[PDB]
Every structure is written in C-alpha cells, then in structure tokens.
Symmetry: C3
C-alpha cells in the first residue's frame, strides 16, 4: 500500500538524522584525540 511507503520513508528520514548526529558526535571525540 501507498501509506506503508510513506511510513517507511518517514522512519528512514529519522534514522538518517540520528546517523548524522552520531557522526557529528564521533567526529567531535575524534577531533579531541587528534589535537589534544
């Protein structure tokens, strides 16, 4: 169905946004090690 698709996409957008944050968090910890 069409609606199931809309929900899969919506959950993917969330997953993606949570991944961008995780990456920013990781980069921050990596930068701490790399400079200090």
């Amino acid at each position: 169905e069409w609606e199931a698709l809309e929900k899969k996409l919506a959950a993917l957008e969330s997953k993606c946004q949570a991944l961008e944050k995780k990456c920013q968090a990781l980069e921050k910890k990596l930068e701490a090690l790399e400079h200090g």
Copy 2:
C-alpha cells in the same frame, strides 16, 4: 513507476542499516583509543 520507488526505498533502508553498523564499529575503535 511505483515499483521502482519501492526498490529505491528498500536499497536505502539497507544502506542505512549498513551505516549504523559502520558507526557502531567506528565508535568501538574510538572508545578503545579514548580509554586505553
């Protein structure tokens, strides 16, 4: 077409899941450096 969309979404869900694992793998290596 509708079916092409369904396939693009399915491949995106896989890509996303592989990215969550990569991030978990990275965080693990980062935590090793950060504590030991």
Copy 3:
C-alpha cells in the same frame, strides 16, 4: 502527493551518500590514530 515522495527519497539518497563519505573520512582519521 506522489511527486513529493519522489523528492523526499531523492534527498534521502543524497543524505545517505554524504553520510557514507563522512564515515569513510572518519575511519581514515581513526586509522591514522590507531596505527601511527
């Protein structure tokens, strides 16, 4: 609408591709710390 969906998916595919690169970039910096 159908077209709005197509655009959301297209922007998600980009976001995902940019995340794979970020992860590769991070892993590269992490590997530098881990071996050198």
